[PDB]
Amino acid sequence: LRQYETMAVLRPDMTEDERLTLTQKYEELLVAGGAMYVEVFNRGVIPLAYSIKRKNKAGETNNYLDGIYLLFTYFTKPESISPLEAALVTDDDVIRSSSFKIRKRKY
Amino acid sequence: HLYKTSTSSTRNGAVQVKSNPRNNLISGQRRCGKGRNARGIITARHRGGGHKRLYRKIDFRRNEKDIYGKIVTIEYDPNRNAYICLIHYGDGEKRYILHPRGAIIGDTIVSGTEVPIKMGNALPLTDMPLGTAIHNIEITLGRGGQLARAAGAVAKLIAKEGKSATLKLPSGEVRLISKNCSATVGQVGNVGVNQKRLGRAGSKRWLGKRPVVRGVVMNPVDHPHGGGEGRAPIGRKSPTTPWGYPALGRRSRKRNKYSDNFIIRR
Amino acid sequence: VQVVVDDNEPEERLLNRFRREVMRAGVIQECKRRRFFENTQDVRKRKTREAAK
Amino acid sequence: GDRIDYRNMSLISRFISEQGKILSRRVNRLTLKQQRLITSAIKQARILSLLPFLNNEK
Amino acid sequence: MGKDTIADIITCIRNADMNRKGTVRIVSTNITENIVKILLREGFIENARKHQERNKYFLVLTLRHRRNKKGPYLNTFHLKRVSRPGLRIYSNYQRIPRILGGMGIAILSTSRGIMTDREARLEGIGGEILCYIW
Amino acid sequence: KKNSFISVISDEKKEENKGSVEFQVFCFTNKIRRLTLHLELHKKDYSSQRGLRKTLGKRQRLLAYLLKINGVRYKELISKLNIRE
RNA sequence: GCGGUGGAAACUACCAAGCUGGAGUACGGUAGGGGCAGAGGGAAUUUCCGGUGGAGCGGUGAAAUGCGUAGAGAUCGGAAAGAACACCAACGGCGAAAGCACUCUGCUGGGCCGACACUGACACUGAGAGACGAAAGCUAGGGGAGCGAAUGGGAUUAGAUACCCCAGUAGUCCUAGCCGUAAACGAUGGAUACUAGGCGCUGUGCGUAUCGACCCGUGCAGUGUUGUAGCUAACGCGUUAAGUAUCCC
């Protein structure tokens, strides 16, 4: 197994408690297959440079100004990396789900 | 050709090379049309004959919802050329559905609201990101018409639009249709299958329809135009019965008029 | 890519010379014309080679 | 000294000038080893909108 | 690589005297040790000794230069191989070359051992002409 | 990876380490059979073809060398790795 | 000159047993637009719809064609789509050549250094042969914002079936197959050993405990040099030489 850090560019629709339940759904996906987790860093509600996904097949008067960013530093199987980013993007939230390979051990 | 499974081309030898089919069928058919272009009193609009038809089948609207699937094997149907497979839902509902693209091995295939977007089955546009690849849209919330020709059946969208109206038809430009509709979300039906050439007619053309060409062939009666030593008074309005081939324009309404916009005409 | 007028005071001075160093007509004269594809990697890097040392 | 860390907005905002354009060789004082590796950390931090692409000075 | 070790010594001494060096290190082989022996007996060099760098055995070759001028006169003006690999030259008792009319000599590997221009004529033997020094 | 490099040195019999004409060929055949299986899915690749012709050319020099020493260790090799000849 | 006999044995060659500096491999690390596939990100351009609002806009050395009061441009809000992807970029890097640069993931090649461990010359080159090929072009199916052969107008001119202006098709983009050419140029084929020096990259060792941006070495690849000897007809090249030599095409 390899060390990964997927940063889900969370859409401003989901609240503080709704991000923490997605961290618990993350545990039932990888730890239930011979894996583990490290920790979570919540950056806070930081405004966008360009409003991405302001409206895509929705109403005309709708603008997504703000946005929250969080990186999940974990440990999982190299075959369970593709259906992981696919299980995230299927929901009406999250703009982008990019997976990264980390060589450094975070404490 | 540019993709795999190139289209076989019969080399020279004797003009063309016909063939002789031979397969089997397992239910899923009524009788299909078998009377040739007629009406019971007047044939109307000539050009249309030759045997080799029958075999209709159904399955288009798809009322089933959140039900998994499993495309068994592929299959072809007369008239329309774009396969139709046979699939196999999780429960066991014998259907057909328009063969998407990458399948044959069963794959996923599933309809209903909130389902995996890829090329499963029915899926309401109401739940679609952009829709760069749909399939067969419906004028209403229950039918299954429009571009049913799986092969090349394309119709992009406009990401997210309100008023419940989008869809970007191909040569039909862009219009506005209800959003409370669903589709196969495949937009595929093989393009190489129709890329092939007929050959030299005879045992490939007539076996589907009577001569498509008429020509002046003189005779002012047999056709609005004609006569002369050999040449024909073309351009001088020579359409079978007041028609008008030089564009002109048709389809005029006021209330239930066309709700399509843009529609460029070069 | 804009310019700073973050300084207060009811002053009438331009201060458009501060951005005329980095941005200027330079990023638009390098662009807005036609690209040479190969002579952009050859001729434009040949004159900077002899002007370096 | 952190070159791979993209999550430090306070450190990387000193590297990026008043414009959204990435720093030159004359300023910041970094060699071609430290460069390209820091630019990949900026290009990544820009998609997360911590540092804007075309940063408006005001 | 090293296609011919008998040819690289000829190049290592020739380029060393042109840029006036004191000692050159060439590869250790018995046939090349026989060429440096009949080089000092005639007087073209000082002496030759055994050496070792890093588990590899090398041969010490000290050259000789004349008096000081604008460019001091060298011992060997030209060094060239006759029996190049892929063009093997063989000669008899009459076809032995007279290099510079008796001033310079040609070292050849004979059946009796390793003889020069004058030494192979007195024995009445011939063979493969390696190189000519002058 | 490291599992394919540690198995090849302990399976076949010859008292030396990786420097063997028996261990070097099965290390190259393992790199050819996995690269040809890569060319089945990635048939659009061009740069991995030069690395296939190099490893095939390096194996042909090692198999021709084993034919010159002894034919006992050569005949027991080519039948185990399942190559032509 | 050819053959035969009796010898000599260094070299070349054959045979046997080795050695190691060649070459190769493994261990552990480093850099890179190397390549293929699949995603996703930002600016801008064009187009469609709507709001505001006015008669001008566009363009040129001047103008005109063209777009405009069935009201553009400009401006704001939203949508659709295609291509390339600023800055960093560098006298940078990688690749056999061609060539390749926004970010990410998946598979994959080559190069280099370092304590070494192992084989052991298993090498170099290489007609034919096989494979790769910028762009343009061709076949079939898609796509098509911009640019733009052709082509249509305006203008310039003695004339211009050019340059310039307004439009604009094939094409340029994608998949598969085909054609294989270029100042495919460092116009100096590949491989190896040697020969004065002074400044710019990447790995690694070391330097009162590295106290520091750094200092002293040791390898790879890469520029310029009043670059020396030498070479060259000269220009120039100059240990990444057209310097001195060897192997082969």
PDB file of N, CA and C (backbone and C1' of nucleotides) in Angstrom, chain G residues 191-221:
ATOM      1  P     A G 191      28.592   7.468 -30.116  1.00  0.00           P
ATOM      2  O5'   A G 191      29.763   6.389 -30.041  1.00  0.00           O
ATOM      3  C5'   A G 191      29.499   5.051 -29.624  1.00  0.00           C
ATOM      4  C4'   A G 191      30.787   4.268 -29.517  1.00  0.00           C
ATOM      5  C3'   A G 191      31.912   4.935 -28.745  1.00  0.00           C
ATOM      6  O3'   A G 191      31.757   4.760 -27.341  1.00  0.00           O
ATOM      7  C1'   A G 191      32.765   4.033 -30.756  1.00  0.00           C
ATOM      8  P     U G 192      32.493   5.769 -26.327  1.00  0.00           P
ATOM      9  O5'   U G 192      34.028   5.353 -26.425  1.00  0.00           O
ATOM     10  C5'   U G 192      34.467   4.078 -25.964  1.00  0.00           C
ATOM     11  C4'   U G 192      35.947   3.903 -26.212  1.00  0.00           C
ATOM     12  C3'   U G 192      36.855   5.008 -25.698  1.00  0.00           C
ATOM     13  O3'   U G 192      37.117   4.854 -24.307  1.00  0.00           O
ATOM     14  C1'   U G 192      37.503   4.403 -27.893  1.00  0.00           C
ATOM     15  P     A G 193      37.664   6.104 -23.454  1.00  0.00           P
ATOM     16  O5'   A G 193      39.207   6.178 -23.842  1.00  0.00           O
ATOM     17  C5'   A G 193      40.086   5.094 -23.550  1.00  0.00           C
ATOM     18  C4'   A G 193      41.465   5.368 -24.102  1.00  0.00           C
ATOM     19  C3'   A G 193      42.093   6.689 -23.690  1.00  0.00           C
ATOM     20  O3'   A G 193      42.708   6.581 -22.410  1.00  0.00           O
ATOM     21  C1'   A G 193      42.359   6.377 -26.022  1.00  0.00           C
ATOM     22  P     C G 194      43.079   7.912 -21.588  1.00  0.00           P
ATOM     23  O5'   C G 194      44.370   8.467 -22.337  1.00  0.00           O
ATOM     24  C5'   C G 194      44.753   9.833 -22.228  1.00  0.00           C
ATOM     25  C4'   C G 194      45.711  10.194 -23.339  1.00  0.00           C
ATOM     26  C3'   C G 194      46.022  11.677 -23.462  1.00  0.00           C
ATOM     27  O3'   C G 194      47.089  12.035 -22.591  1.00  0.00           O
ATOM     28  C1'   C G 194      45.453  10.811 -25.588  1.00  0.00           C
ATOM     29  P     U G 195      46.965  13.349 -21.673  1.00  0.00           P
ATOM     30  O5'   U G 195      47.158  14.556 -22.696  1.00  0.00           O
ATOM     31  C5'   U G 195      48.453  14.917 -23.175  1.00  0.00           C
ATOM     32  C4'   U G 195      48.352  16.083 -24.131  1.00  0.00           C
ATOM     33  C3'   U G 195      47.596  17.295 -23.608  1.00  0.00           C
ATOM     34  O3'   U G 195      48.467  18.142 -22.864  1.00  0.00           O
ATOM     35  C1'   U G 195      46.821  16.750 -25.779  1.00  0.00           C
ATOM     36  P     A G 196      48.092  18.552 -21.354  1.00  0.00           P
ATOM     37  O5'   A G 196      46.936  19.640 -21.503  1.00  0.00           O
ATOM     38  C5'   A G 196      47.003  20.657 -22.502  1.00  0.00           C
ATOM     39  C4'   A G 196      47.788  21.844 -21.993  1.00  0.00           C
ATOM     40  C3'   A G 196      47.166  22.629 -20.847  1.00  0.00           C
ATOM     41  O3'   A G 196      47.427  22.038 -19.579  1.00  0.00           O
ATOM     42  C1'   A G 196      47.910  24.134 -22.504  1.00  0.00           C
ATOM     43  P     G G 197      46.380  22.247 -18.373  1.00  0.00           P
ATOM     44  O5'   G G 197      46.106  23.818 -18.362  1.00  0.00           O
ATOM     45  C5'   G G 197      44.982  24.367 -17.674  1.00  0.00           C
ATOM     46  C4'   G G 197      44.862  25.847 -17.965  1.00  0.00           C
ATOM     47  C3'   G G 197      43.607  26.525 -17.434  1.00  0.00           C
ATOM     48  O3'   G G 197      43.759  26.922 -16.074  1.00  0.00           O
ATOM     49  C1'   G G 197      43.921  27.125 -19.697  1.00  0.00           C
ATOM     50  P     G G 198      42.468  26.996 -15.113  1.00  0.00           P
ATOM     51  O5'   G G 198      41.736  28.348 -15.541  1.00  0.00           O
ATOM     52  C5'   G G 198      42.257  29.620 -15.157  1.00  0.00           C
ATOM     53  C4'   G G 198      41.421  30.735 -15.746  1.00  0.00           C
ATOM     54  C3'   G G 198      39.939  30.731 -15.393  1.00  0.00           C
ATOM     55  O3'   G G 198      39.702  31.374 -14.143  1.00  0.00           O
ATOM     56  C1'   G G 198      40.193  31.044 -17.722  1.00  0.00           C
ATOM     57  P     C G 199      38.468  30.903 -13.222  1.00  0.00           P
ATOM     58  O5'   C G 199      37.192  31.602 -13.876  1.00  0.00           O
ATOM     59  C5'   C G 199      35.872  31.212 -13.499  1.00  0.00           C
ATOM     60  C4'   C G 199      34.844  31.971 -14.310  1.00  0.00           C
ATOM     61  C3'   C G 199      33.422  31.435 -14.211  1.00  0.00           C
ATOM     62  O3'   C G 199      32.733  31.991 -13.094  1.00  0.00           O
ATOM     63  C1'   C G 199      34.002  31.710 -16.487  1.00  0.00           C
ATOM     64  P     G G 200      31.692  31.086 -12.261  1.00  0.00           P
ATOM     65  O5'   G G 200      30.335  31.171 -13.095  1.00  0.00           O
ATOM     66  C5'   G G 200      29.312  30.188 -12.931  1.00  0.00           C
ATOM     67  C4'   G G 200      28.278  30.313 -14.028  1.00  0.00           C
ATOM     68  C3'   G G 200      27.367  29.103 -14.192  1.00  0.00           C
ATOM     69  O3'   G G 200      26.225  29.185 -13.341  1.00  0.00           O
ATOM     70  C1'   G G 200      28.290  29.684 -16.289  1.00  0.00           C
ATOM     71  P     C G 201      25.854  27.949 -12.375  1.00  0.00           P
ATOM     72  O5'   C G 201      24.551  27.302 -13.029  1.00  0.00           O
ATOM     73  C5'   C G 201      23.904  26.189 -12.409  1.00  0.00           C
ATOM     74  C4'   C G 201      23.337  25.254 -13.453  1.00  0.00           C
ATOM     75  C3'   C G 201      22.931  23.881 -12.932  1.00  0.00           C
ATOM     76  O3'   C G 201      21.585  23.888 -12.470  1.00  0.00           O
ATOM     77  C1'   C G 201      24.305  23.622 -14.836  1.00  0.00           C
ATOM     78  P     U G 202      21.222  23.268 -11.032  1.00  0.00           P
ATOM     79  O5'   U G 202      21.439  21.696 -11.193  1.00  0.00           O
ATOM     80  C5'   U G 202      20.348  20.823 -11.492  1.00  0.00           C
ATOM     81  C4'   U G 202      20.831  19.392 -11.599  1.00  0.00           C
ATOM     82  C3'   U G 202      21.458  18.791 -10.347  1.00  0.00           C
ATOM     83  O3'   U G 202      20.485  18.230  -9.469  1.00  0.00           O
ATOM     84  C1'   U G 202      22.906  18.438 -12.169  1.00  0.00           C
ATOM     85  P     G G 203      20.861  17.962  -7.926  1.00  0.00           P
ATOM     86  O5'   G G 203      21.824  16.690  -7.966  1.00  0.00           O
ATOM     87  C5'   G G 203      21.305  15.388  -8.234  1.00  0.00           C
ATOM     88  C4'   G G 203      22.373  14.330  -8.042  1.00  0.00           C
ATOM     89  C3'   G G 203      23.071  14.280  -6.691  1.00  0.00           C
ATOM     90  O3'   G G 203      22.304  13.566  -5.724  1.00  0.00           O
ATOM     91  C1'   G G 203      24.673  14.079  -8.422  1.00  0.00           C
ATOM     92  P     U G 204      22.543  13.840  -4.155  1.00  0.00           P
ATOM     93  O5'   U G 204      24.051  13.389  -3.898  1.00  0.00           O
ATOM     94  C5'   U G 204      24.421  12.009  -3.914  1.00  0.00           C
ATOM     95  C4'   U G 204      25.923  11.861  -3.795  1.00  0.00           C
ATOM     96  C3'   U G 204      26.572  12.485  -2.568  1.00  0.00           C
ATOM     97  O3'   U G 204      26.513  11.611  -1.443  1.00  0.00           O
ATOM     98  C1'   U G 204      27.784  13.115  -4.494  1.00  0.00           C
ATOM     99  P     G G 205      26.752  12.196   0.039  1.00  0.00           P
ATOM    100  O5'   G G 205      28.333  12.387   0.133  1.00  0.00           O
ATOM    101  C5'   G G 205      29.202  11.263   0.251  1.00  0.00           C
ATOM    102  C4'   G G 205      30.645  11.711   0.355  1.00  0.00           C
ATOM    103  C3'   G G 205      30.974  12.695   1.469  1.00  0.00           C
ATOM    104  O3'   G G 205      31.191  12.029   2.710  1.00  0.00           O
ATOM    105  C1'   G G 205      31.964  13.430  -0.548  1.00  0.00           C
ATOM    106  P     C G 206      30.958  12.819   4.093  1.00  0.00           P
ATOM    107  O5'   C G 206      32.079  13.954   4.092  1.00  0.00           O
ATOM    108  C5'   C G 206      33.466  13.616   4.138  1.00  0.00           C
ATOM    109  C4'   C G 206      34.318  14.843   3.896  1.00  0.00           C
ATOM    110  C3'   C G 206      34.121  16.004   4.861  1.00  0.00           C
ATOM    111  O3'   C G 206      34.904  15.830   6.038  1.00  0.00           O
ATOM    112  C1'   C G 206      34.104  16.816   2.640  1.00  0.00           C
ATOM    113  P     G G 207      34.513  16.623   7.384  1.00  0.00           P
ATOM    114  O5'   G G 207      34.824  18.149   7.043  1.00  0.00           O
ATOM    115  C5'   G G 207      36.163  18.601   6.834  1.00  0.00           C
ATOM    116  C4'   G G 207      36.176  20.079   6.506  1.00  0.00           C
ATOM    117  C3'   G G 207      35.497  20.989   7.520  1.00  0.00           C
ATOM    118  O3'   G G 207      36.419  21.356   8.544  1.00  0.00           O
ATOM    119  C1'   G G 207      34.792  21.553   5.322  1.00  0.00           C
ATOM    120  P     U G 208      36.286  20.717  10.014  1.00  0.00           P
ATOM    121  O5'   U G 208      35.026  21.447  10.663  1.00  0.00           O
ATOM    122  C5'   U G 208      35.045  22.846  10.953  1.00  0.00           C
ATOM    123  C4'   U G 208      35.657  23.092  12.315  1.00  0.00           C
ATOM    124  C3'   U G 208      34.966  22.411  13.488  1.00  0.00           C
ATOM    125  O3'   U G 208      35.442  21.069  13.610  1.00  0.00           O
ATOM    126  C1'   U G 208      35.342  24.689  14.009  1.00  0.00           C
ATOM    127  P     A G 209      34.894  20.105  14.783  1.00  0.00           P
ATOM    128  O5'   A G 209      33.339  20.430  14.931  1.00  0.00           O
ATOM    129  C5'   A G 209      32.526  20.720  13.799  1.00  0.00           C
ATOM    130  C4'   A G 209      31.222  19.964  13.876  1.00  0.00           C
ATOM    131  C3'   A G 209      30.129  20.523  12.981  1.00  0.00           C
ATOM    132  O3'   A G 209      30.255  20.014  11.655  1.00  0.00           O
ATOM    133  C1'   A G 209      29.265  20.136  15.154  1.00  0.00           C
ATOM    134  P     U G 210      31.263  20.724  10.620  1.00  0.00           P
ATOM    135  O5'   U G 210      30.450  20.770   9.251  1.00  0.00           O
ATOM    136  C5'   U G 210      30.998  21.394   8.092  1.00  0.00           C
ATOM    137  C4'   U G 210      30.033  22.419   7.545  1.00  0.00           C
ATOM    138  C3'   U G 210      29.661  23.540   8.505  1.00  0.00           C
ATOM    139  O3'   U G 210      30.603  24.608   8.422  1.00  0.00           O
ATOM    140  C1'   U G 210      27.691  22.608   7.590  1.00  0.00           C
ATOM    141  P     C G 211      31.194  25.264   9.769  1.00  0.00           P
ATOM    142  O5'   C G 211      30.689  26.775   9.730  1.00  0.00           O
ATOM    143  C5'   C G 211      29.344  27.096   9.374  1.00  0.00           C
ATOM    144  C4'   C G 211      28.428  26.892  10.558  1.00  0.00           C
ATOM    145  C3'   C G 211      27.005  27.396  10.388  1.00  0.00           C
ATOM    146  O3'   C G 211      26.206  26.442   9.694  1.00  0.00           O
ATOM    147  C1'   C G 211      27.844  28.088  12.489  1.00  0.00           C
ATOM    148  P     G G 212      24.842  26.909   8.981  1.00  0.00           P
ATOM    149  O5'   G G 212      25.196  28.328   8.344  1.00  0.00           O
ATOM    150  C5'   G G 212      24.414  29.485   8.643  1.00  0.00           C
ATOM    151  C4'   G G 212      24.727  30.600   7.671  1.00  0.00           C
ATOM    152  C3'   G G 212      24.611  30.246   6.198  1.00  0.00           C
ATOM    153  O3'   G G 212      23.261  30.371   5.761  1.00  0.00           O
ATOM    154  C1'   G G 212      26.634  31.420   6.583  1.00  0.00           C
ATOM    155  P     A G 213      22.631  29.270   4.770  1.00  0.00           P
ATOM    156  O5'   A G 213      22.432  30.061   3.399  1.00  0.00           O
ATOM    157  C5'   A G 213      23.353  29.915   2.321  1.00  0.00           C
ATOM    158  C4'   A G 213      23.232  31.085   1.372  1.00  0.00           C
ATOM    159  C3'   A G 213      24.201  31.076   0.201  1.00  0.00           C
ATOM    160  O3'   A G 213      23.704  30.296  -0.883  1.00  0.00           O
ATOM    161  C1'   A G 213      24.219  33.211   1.213  1.00  0.00           C
ATOM    162  P     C G 214      24.736  29.542  -1.859  1.00  0.00           P
ATOM    163  O5'   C G 214      25.974  30.542  -1.942  1.00  0.00           O
ATOM    164  C5'   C G 214      27.314  30.060  -1.937  1.00  0.00           C
ATOM    165  C4'   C G 214      28.002  30.447  -0.647  1.00  0.00           C
ATOM    166  C3'   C G 214      29.416  29.912  -0.493  1.00  0.00           C
ATOM    167  O3'   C G 214      30.349  30.798  -1.104  1.00  0.00           O
ATOM    168  C1'   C G 214      28.182  29.451   1.473  1.00  0.00           C
ATOM    169  P     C G 215      31.489  30.211  -2.071  1.00  0.00           P
ATOM    170  O5'   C G 215      32.445  29.398  -1.089  1.00  0.00           O
ATOM    171  C5'   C G 215      33.504  30.048  -0.390  1.00  0.00           C
ATOM    172  C4'   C G 215      34.455  29.025   0.188  1.00  0.00           C
ATOM    173  C3'   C G 215      34.939  27.961  -0.785  1.00  0.00           C
ATOM    174  O3'   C G 215      36.048  28.428  -1.547  1.00  0.00           O
ATOM    175  C1'   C G 215      34.223  26.927   1.216  1.00  0.00           C
ATOM    176  P     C G 216      36.383  27.750  -2.966  1.00  0.00           P
ATOM    177  O5'   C G 216      37.021  26.344  -2.572  1.00  0.00           O
ATOM    178  C5'   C G 216      38.259  26.275  -1.867  1.00  0.00           C
ATOM    179  C4'   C G 216      38.583  24.842  -1.514  1.00  0.00           C
ATOM    180  C3'   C G 216      38.545  23.857  -2.671  1.00  0.00           C
ATOM    181  O3'   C G 216      39.766  23.858  -3.404  1.00  0.00           O
ATOM    182  C1'   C G 216      37.364  22.955  -0.830  1.00  0.00           C
ATOM    183  P     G G 217      39.761  23.436  -4.956  1.00  0.00           P
ATOM    184  O5'   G G 217      38.654  22.293  -5.022  1.00  0.00           O
ATOM    185  C5'   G G 217      38.716  21.248  -5.985  1.00  0.00           C
ATOM    186  C4'   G G 217      38.710  19.908  -5.288  1.00  0.00           C
ATOM    187  C3'   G G 217      38.391  18.710  -6.165  1.00  0.00           C
ATOM    188  O3'   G G 217      39.559  18.232  -6.824  1.00  0.00           O
ATOM    189  C1'   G G 217      37.091  18.615  -4.189  1.00  0.00           C
ATOM    190  P     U G 218      39.460  17.708  -8.340  1.00  0.00           P
ATOM    191  O5'   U G 218      38.408  16.513  -8.269  1.00  0.00           O
ATOM    192  C5'   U G 218      38.743  15.275  -7.643  1.00  0.00           C
ATOM    193  C4'   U G 218      37.537  14.364  -7.602  1.00  0.00           C
ATOM    194  C3'   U G 218      36.836  14.136  -8.933  1.00  0.00           C
ATOM    195  O3'   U G 218      37.468  13.105  -9.685  1.00  0.00           O
ATOM    196  C1'   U G 218      35.228  14.656  -7.280  1.00  0.00           C
ATOM    197  P     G G 219      37.288  13.062 -11.283  1.00  0.00           P
ATOM    198  O5'   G G 219      35.735  12.762 -11.481  1.00  0.00           O
ATOM    199  C5'   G G 219      35.066  13.104 -12.692  1.00  0.00           C
ATOM    200  C4'   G G 219      33.759  12.352 -12.794  1.00  0.00           C
ATOM    201  C3'   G G 219      32.846  12.772 -13.935  1.00  0.00           C
ATOM    202  O3'   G G 219      33.192  12.126 -15.155  1.00  0.00           O
ATOM    203  C1'   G G 219      31.594  12.670 -11.939  1.00  0.00           C
ATOM    204  P     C G 220      32.825  12.825 -16.557  1.00  0.00           P
ATOM    205  O5'   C G 220      31.230  12.829 -16.580  1.00  0.00           O
ATOM    206  C5'   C G 220      30.497  11.618 -16.754  1.00  0.00           C
ATOM    207  C4'   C G 220      29.033  11.914 -16.996  1.00  0.00           C
ATOM    208  C3'   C G 220      28.723  12.921 -18.092  1.00  0.00           C
ATOM    209  O3'   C G 220      28.741  12.307 -19.377  1.00  0.00           O
ATOM    210  C1'   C G 220      27.421  13.408 -16.175  1.00  0.00           C
ATOM    211  P     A G 221      29.267  13.137 -20.650  1.00  0.00           P
ATOM    212  O5'   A G 221      28.108  14.194 -20.930  1.00  0.00           O
ATOM    213  C5'   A G 221      26.844  13.777 -21.446  1.00  0.00           C
ATOM    214  C4'   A G 221      25.825  14.885 -21.302  1.00  0.00           C
ATOM    215  C3'   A G 221      26.188  16.217 -21.943  1.00  0.00           C
ATOM    216  O3'   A G 221      25.853  16.239 -23.327  1.00  0.00           O
ATOM    217  C1'   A G 221      25.434  16.592 -19.738  1.00  0.00           C
TER     218        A G 221
END
